[PDB]
């Protein structure tokens, strides 16, 4: 079989909530803020605005990577498809 993942696509495209676990994301946001500068602290709405921008940005990256792999006649993504998707965007 090896292909019913196509039903996951349709489920997670029907769904529209945020997908990364809030605590892990908040821990990472704080860790990246705290080694950047002292005593920066985030309102919940700022962490949510960050996470929505991140996940929308990654959905864009995966759509772009999909078209790179489809263009390469693949049905699979490798890190090189992401590195094209960065250089072709200028990222």
């Amino acid at each position: 079989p090896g292909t019913v993942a196509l039903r996951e696509i349709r489920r997670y495209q029907k769904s529209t909530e945020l997908l990364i676990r809030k605590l892990p994301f908040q821990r990472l946001v704080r860790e990246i803020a705290q080694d950047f500068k002292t005593d920066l602290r985030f309102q919940s709405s700022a962490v949510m605005a960050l996470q929505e921008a991140c996940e929308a940005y990654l959905v864009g990256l995966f759509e772009d990577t999909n078209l790179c792999a489809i263009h390469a006649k693949r049905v699979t993504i490798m890190p090189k498809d992401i590195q094209l998707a960065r250089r072709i965007r200028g990222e």
Binding site: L6, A53, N66, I70
Partner: protein, 108 residues
């Protein structure tokens, strides 16, 4: 002096022309604001907002729903190339993505 009423009502307009007349001067965009400019901008904002609000209500109608959510607003953008261009630099909170498949993914 007379009992007050909105300047929008004489213009034929649905948004607050008075605070548009405030914003256009208070935002330091110019030294002077022409008497038509806030009426014109209210009319433009109303026209474009009503045009997308029909698509919002139609997106909910298509999904057979009665209460608008950000998903219906994302569907309203992805139902019109003018909005897909205009909002091409916009993120919609909880709006998700349009459901789509490249034919290569399909069995047979």
């Amino acid at each position: 002096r007379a009992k007050a009423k909105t300047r929008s009502s004489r213009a034929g307009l649905q948004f607050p022309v008075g605070r548009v007349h405030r914003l256009l001067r208070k935002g330091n965009y110019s030294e002077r604001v022409g008497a038509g400019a806030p009426v014109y901008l209210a009319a433009v904002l109303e026209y474009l907002t009503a045009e997308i609000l029909e698509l919002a209500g139609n997106a909910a109608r298509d999904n057979k729903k009665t209460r608008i959510i950000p998903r219906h607003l994302q569907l309203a953008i992805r139902n019109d190339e003018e909005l897909n261009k205009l909002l091409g630099r916009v993120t919609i909170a909880q709006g998700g993505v349009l459901p789509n498949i490249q034919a290569v993914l399909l069995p047979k």
